Amino acid sequence: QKCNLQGQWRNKLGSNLIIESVSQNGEFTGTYFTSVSLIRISPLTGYQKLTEKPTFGFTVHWAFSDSITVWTGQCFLNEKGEEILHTMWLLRSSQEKEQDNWTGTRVGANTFTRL
Amino acid sequence: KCNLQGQWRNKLGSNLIIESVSQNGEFTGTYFTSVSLTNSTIRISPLTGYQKLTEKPTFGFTVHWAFSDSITVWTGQCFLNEKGEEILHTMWLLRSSQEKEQDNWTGTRVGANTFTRLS
Amino acid sequence: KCNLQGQWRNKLGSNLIIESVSQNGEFTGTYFTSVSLTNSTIRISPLTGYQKLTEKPTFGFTVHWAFSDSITVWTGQCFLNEKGEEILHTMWLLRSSQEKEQDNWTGTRVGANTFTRLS
Amino acid sequence: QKCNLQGQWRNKLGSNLIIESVSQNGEFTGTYFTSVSLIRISPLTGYQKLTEKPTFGFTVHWAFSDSITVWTGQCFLNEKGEEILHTMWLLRSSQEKEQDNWTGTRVGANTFTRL
Ligand SMILES: O=C(O)CCCC[C@@H]1SC[C@@H]2NC(=O)N[C@@H]21
Ligand SMILES: O=C(O)CCCC[C@@H]1SC[C@@H]2NC(=O)N[C@@H]21
């Protein structure tokens, strides 16, 4: 356990984060399955650092919606010795007009643990 | 619709280049920041993300800084302004690498930037 | 130092008025927003907050919207620009009232605004 | 238990939030005691809504520091029937120059429970 993000993860909302083999340069791909909404299987792409307790970020391209979410976070080993992802996210909604842009960005935080 | 391809700058003078956009909305490119937290030499850094292929597309991307242990993500939407020029309204989160879990709370900065074409 | 007292506007046309500043940094005033989530009639709403009484003061405040169940908080810093005019750089969180705990995650919007004096 | 914010609260960082009697118009005052830093007793001022499951916000004026934090959130009764504050916050640090403003705002989330 050294925070190679590869594998399946869940958050408290019940969403599933599936991350593939991390490339030599830290790039990864995967799949996001969400139970909440403002059933979707959506692709993601991002990067992780190659260090101990890596930082990372990724974008989910929500299927059948005009929204996008980005997450960024860092992986740590908790007190019980297990890997936890601490994240914060921005959820962008599509606005009809430029003047409505101020309303288009939600923010939040979630922790992921392994399935 | 927008064409996120090409070169953009923000008010800080940072340069965003989107190299290619695929039919699934995925894109790749580079980011050259005019500002940093670190005292290390800034270098061009890679990015990956997605856009919607719609009118006034939303998009998001991650920059994997080549010169620090940080990561930044942006998400935003492209509009045409009054003059009919393309503008990307974005907000971003900058993650710094913390030493221990107990310091996690200090690790995330937030901000906004608007990108335009090079004048 | 800045004098946060008086009238300010942001790029959306919203009007921030700071009525008074006490020696402990506490201030009160009102906010009139040019934009809202609701379709209800916008009305002037009260605010309370604090500034540092330093050069280039940081500050924060909360607006208790009079016409909705939302709350917004801003925090920022005052600088002098190139022309020697006062500017407040802020970021804000807008909390909307959610029906149930399970919807909490949808409840917080974020953004940035800069405020200047009335021209 | 109907989310009158009055009383003592703690978050997972071990900070203490002390909120006084809420006024007729929803305004409140109080005191914030933090264990983390970038011992402080600091004043706060803010407002709560007068509704069920009230939203709220407040500013803490950190003693002996040039920083400010604002929180905004909503109070709910959890599954065990107890009051929880779900919050997000912006922490502003004082920058030396206008050009450094981009680096001055941290963001986060915390949940408070009663002491
Ligand atoms: O110093 C680091 O650790 C990485 C560089 C951070 C650059 C930040 S990220 C958000 C903001 N927008 C930019 O044009 N650059 C900065
Ligand atoms: O509609 C509501 O529920 C309350 C009005 C929200 C106004 C928002 S808060 C942040 C942003 N800055 C402004 O000048 N007004 C909007």
Author numbering:
A (entry chain A), D (entry chain A): 4 to 41, 46 to 122
B (entry chain D), C (entry chain D): 5 to 123
Could you pull the original sentences from the published paper?
Xenavidin overexpressed in insect cells was crystallized with and without D-biotin (BTN) added to the crystallization solution. The structures crystallized in a rhombohedral space group and had a dimer in their asymmetric unit (for the structure determination statistics). The subunits of the dimer found in the asymmetric units of the xenavidin crystals are labelled A and D to match the numbering system generally used to describe the biological unit of chicken avidin (tetramer; subunits I-IV;). In the unliganded structure of xenavidin, there was no clear electron density for biotin in subunit A. However, weak electron density was evident for the ligand at the binding site in subunit D; thus, a biotin molecule was built into subunit D of the unliganded xenavidin structure despite the presence of weak electron density around the ligand. In the BTN-complex structure, D-biotin was clearly present in both of the biotin-binding sites of the asymmetric unit. A water molecule was detected in the unliganded structure of xenavidin at the bottom of the ligand-binding site bridging the carboxamide group of N117 and biotin (bridging was evident only in subunit D); the conformation of N117 in the unliganded structure differs from that in the structure of the xenavidin-biotin complex. Thus, the unliganded structure of xenavidin may represent the first example of an intermediate structure of the avidin family, with a structural water molecule located deep within the biotin-binding pocket and lending support to the water-bridged model of biotin association/dissociation. Interestingly, N117, the residue analogous to D128 of streptavidin and N118 of avidin, has an altered conformation in unliganded xenavidin compared to N117 of the biotin-complex structure of xenavidin, suggesting a potentially important role for this residue in the water-mediated association/dissociation mechanism of avidins in general.
Here we report, to our knowledge, the first biochemical and structural characterization of an amphibian avidin - xenavidin - a frog avidin from Xenopus tropicalis. In general, both of the xenavidin structures were highly similar to the known structures of avidin and streptavidin: the 3D structure of xenavidin is homotetrameric, each subunit consisting of an eight-stranded β-barrel. The amino acids lining the biotin-binding pocket are structurally conserved between xenavidin and chicken avidin. Our results show that xenavidin is a well-conserved member of the avidin protein family having a tetrameric structure, N-glycosylation and extremely tight biotin-binding capability that is mediated via numerous non-covalent interactions including hydrogen bonds, hydrophobic interactions and van der Waals contacts.
